[PDB]
Design a protein around this ligand. Structure first.
Ligand SMILES: O=P(O)(O)OC[C@H]1O[C@](O)(CO)[C@@H](O)[C@@H]1O
Ligand SMILES: [Mn+2]
Ligand SMILES: [Mn+2]
Ligand SMILES: [Mn+2]
Ligand SMILES: [Mn+2]
Ligand SMILES: [Mn+2]
Ligand SMILES: [Mn+2]
Lengths: 324, 325, 328, 325
């Protein structure tokens, strides 16, 4: 039941794209959530949303604990109908629609709080190539020697945020190159394991669900990632305690975020550093269509599929027919 | 419900066929693909009857006409070829494919395994009637060139390199058209007419009827026109055809008459062709060694077409024959 | 002019792009521009042209330059050469999108001689777009429905691109109120404008105000790809109108057609430094068949022959040394 | 240095050949390629001497051995094939190329047009002596399989489908290697060993000597090893080797012996093949209709490889024969 996930993320990405460049992040997310639930309920799984649009009193669709699917195997479901709602409204880089499946319990069940992350790709990388509590340069050195390149050849990716100034500055003292994304650290983490992405390491603090989703994909591509939750509120801490978290400062390896039999699928909404975005295409051959660029992958078989889909459409009509 | 899941079958049949590439052994090629395909197809959630396959249950033990396949689901008719181009693959020539098509019951033309005249052109907007087998090559190419908005000498016509086609090749060439020949693979050659950047505008030729119905099914999804006529040389062949309900022995079949209803079509390239790229061995830093497959899966109802590049893990320090069933 | 003058120009943009890339993500916009200028000036002096620079980089402290009037090659035809060693020094310094290295050539006089002022830009691609489809004096909504009708699509399918700058809030609001989609780039309106005529850029229209040398450079490409563009220089102060008058410009508010920006026999070459909406950026590749290399992606195109070439280059390098051994 | 402008010479040669693709007229294919490549070669700022071409003067009027070509520049030796695969192009088959290589004087084995034994493998790191014409096929492959880090059953060996290779095929298959056959074009077939994702690891075969030198000029830029040996069957064949200086008739040439020094290599694809995509007609509305060519150009000294996809405006309402002289 892996391949079907890609039509879910495909339809959600087409819905997001009808709202790209509209300046309305509410309407982009709403379009995506609508398309994702409609499509997800025609998938033969008994899915339980463990990461999604929020918890029930905030999100009427795709909330934590909602059961989804038409019936089938029992699966834990980690969604983000639109990763990059603000990116999409702006037309910026790195927006995605994401869907990951695991056996029940396979995903870290953590609140939607911030998370420190470090990640690197490679098939043959020892767990321990990256350590959150080590220095950037000692992390970069271990990585530069595993890859066989001078440290200054490494390209490090992080988000353009003040909280990242010390990472940016420390990696830059010993020669490494550090490129900045405005948003999209699901894409930024997975790029470390994506051919020709041009990114070797991702370092930074972003949302916790977004980190689990990326860890799911890195679990299928090969690579390492360590993560720590960060709490600001005291209801965040009570939220965590309720979920069974006793150690607020626990480090998580990539296996602690996503273990066992993982299916991951994603579709580009905009051009980013991992997937290409949805495009309008004309042709005399088949008329006009929207192209989507997707990836579905599986941790057991290590198989990765790259899917380019042609979806017929007549753009003489309003674009908002790509909403469901 | 089960469309994308069809690619995994043609992928496994193609890796199986590929391990037999250039081995000189057309039988081992065909057997590896049939085994991979039947193993993979029984593990798809359909209730499938094979209507086009490896043979009748007499001649072929596996994937025979009438065989039930699938793990359980909705009733579908199955049109398959585990390995289109067994000889191609044994030699590593162009255009070998593994093919799998599925329709509603009765969607596929039920014809005996006789020869079949084919003429195919691609284009979503091509009018039915743009090609006719009773009309001449020149007048067919004439209308096609007009429809495509090109001088007729820009048209590229594909046919097989066969003595039986010798007059096709000269007639098309008198009036300026370019005519290229493939050594085998008229499933790929017909489908190439509606494949982007194939470089092939028209297919004209005679070959197997199963191969004709499979190519018609892909063209019904990609948009295009095709006309076919069954060819009878024998009296058993004509008895054969009466019992399948055929009465007009030189009927001309349209695309709609070859494949109709809710068609899904899947193919994976075995060797490089004019429609799909073949299986290749790849090394990388990031994931080590894998085989890459290139596949296409498409659906007539939605007109959605998917191009799938798959990375299947493997260590080639072992033999290559560890991609079989 | 001749046939030597085309495909060799990509060698220039490729060496500048490699030098810029060794400075990608270092946070030093000065060092990046310096590497690009030095590499480009060294490679450009291996190109059989008696070139005169008519368009330089940006500022004299922002890096050195190939200055307006400098003479390069010195062994060939009387060529005006417009060039940007690193378009996107800030972009490159932080690894953002749309950074390019650009070289354009013309017959003497073929480029618009303007000062380095801002310029209003309106661009669309399509080789059948009739001059007149975009007019700066028309409203945004009225250019967009003129473009939607010529593209045979509903207005809400168009993608308008512009820079995330306050001076563009009005173009953004006015284009979104009648249904159009407006995407934003942080920088890079050479890439942004040329995008309108790059297959699968996803960009239908560019509308925005930016540097005038950038506009001419974009125009030289659009002239080669088929497209329309109209431009108007913009002047804030008198000490900067004087610059215009010194250069022969009398009508401060002239609208410039794409012919006026770039005319006659045009050659355009560009190489991507970072990934953008026109060109992929430089990447490190590992392989066993040829070891390690850096891959560049470039385009070179001619206005007289309409010929466009997309060039993927493999340059070997040992990534066991510093990355700083790509500078020149 | 004019090195990259080589590309447009092979591009024009290729557009002219393509206009004869699938016409069953190989002379007309060859002629169109010969004027197209001679006319545009004369715009290149070189002073070139054809050391390898489409004939001697008393056999070939144009691009004959020794002819002075160019418009003035650095003295250079010129190794041409205006169309590699004249019969291929005539029938639309795989692997037709146009080829142009430059070198400092004396850089190319000034070889007479005779048959040439060949064995070639790709890879920047292969030691000279990885392949040797006198070793057995099973011993060469074991060595290559070792160097490429795979089981010999994973290797893909290429060779022409010619009886003279009955025994190459059989011996290589007998210890498990995979052998794929091409109908023609052993320039593309040899270079393919070093082309990324070609699918071919080793070429072993006997074909024309000039085609061997052109290939080795490309392997010299991509990284590889190649042995060649001239073969003679006529006393007239041996006289041509004697006229051209050659004393040792059974010499084994190394790659450096076929091509040495500052080498530029340019090729454009005519038809799809195992090294380059062929010319295609394209219709967009953004730029109208065009022909797309696919070329590669490399230099021995810098090791830089450039892949070049070119768009050539053309009106296909007009006959296709404007892409000529
Ligand atoms: O000040 P910014 O935003 O870095 O823009 C610099 C650009 O302006 C110019 O100086 C003139 O447009 C350009 O050459 C340069 O690329
Ligand atoms: Mn989201
Ligand atoms: Mn979030
Ligand atoms: Mn078969
Ligand atoms: Mn058959
Ligand atoms: Mn600049
Ligand atoms: Mn020849």
């Amino acid at each position: 039941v892996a391949l079907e996930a890609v039509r879910v993320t495909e339809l959600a990405a087409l819905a997001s794209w009808s709202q790209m460049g509209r300046g309305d992040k509410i309407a982009a997310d709403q379009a995506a959530v609508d398309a994702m639930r409609k499509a997800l309920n025609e998938v033969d799984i008994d899915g339980t949303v463990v990461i999604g649009e929020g918890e029930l009193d905030e999100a009427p669709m795709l909330y934590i604990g909602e059961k989804v699917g038409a019936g089938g195997c029992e699966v834990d479901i980690a969604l983000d109908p639109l990763e990059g709602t603000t990116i999409t409204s702006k037309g910026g880089a790195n927006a995605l629609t994401v869907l990951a499946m695991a056996d029940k319990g396979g995903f870290l069940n953590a609140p939607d709080v911030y998370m420190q992350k470090i990640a690197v790709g490679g098939i043959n990388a020892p767990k321990g190539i990256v350590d959150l509590d080590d220095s950037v340069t000692n992390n970069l050195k271990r990585i530069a020697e595993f890859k066989g390149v001078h440290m200054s050849a490494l390209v490090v990716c992080t988000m353009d945020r003040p909280r990242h100034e010390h990472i940016i500055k420390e990696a830059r003292e010993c020669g490494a190159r550090v490129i900045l994304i405005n948003d999209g650290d699901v894409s930024g983490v997975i790029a470390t394991a994506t051919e020709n992405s041009g990114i070797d390491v991702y370092i930074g603090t972003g949302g916790a669900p977004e980190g689990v989703l990326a860890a799911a994909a890195l679990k299928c591509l090969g690579g390492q990632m360590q993560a720590r939750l960060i709490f600001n509120d005291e209801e965040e801490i009570k939220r965590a305690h309720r979920l069974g978290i006793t150690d607020l400062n626990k480090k998580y390896d990539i296996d602690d975020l996503a273990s066992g039999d993982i299916v991951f699928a994603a579709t580009g909404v905009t051009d980013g550093n991992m997937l290409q975005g949805v495009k309008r295409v004309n042709s005399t051959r088949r008329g006009s269509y929207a192209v989507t660029h997707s990836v579905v992958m599986r941790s057991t078989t290590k198989t990765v599929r790259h899917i380019t889909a042609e979806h017929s459409f007549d753009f003489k009509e309003g674009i908002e027919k790509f909403m469901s």
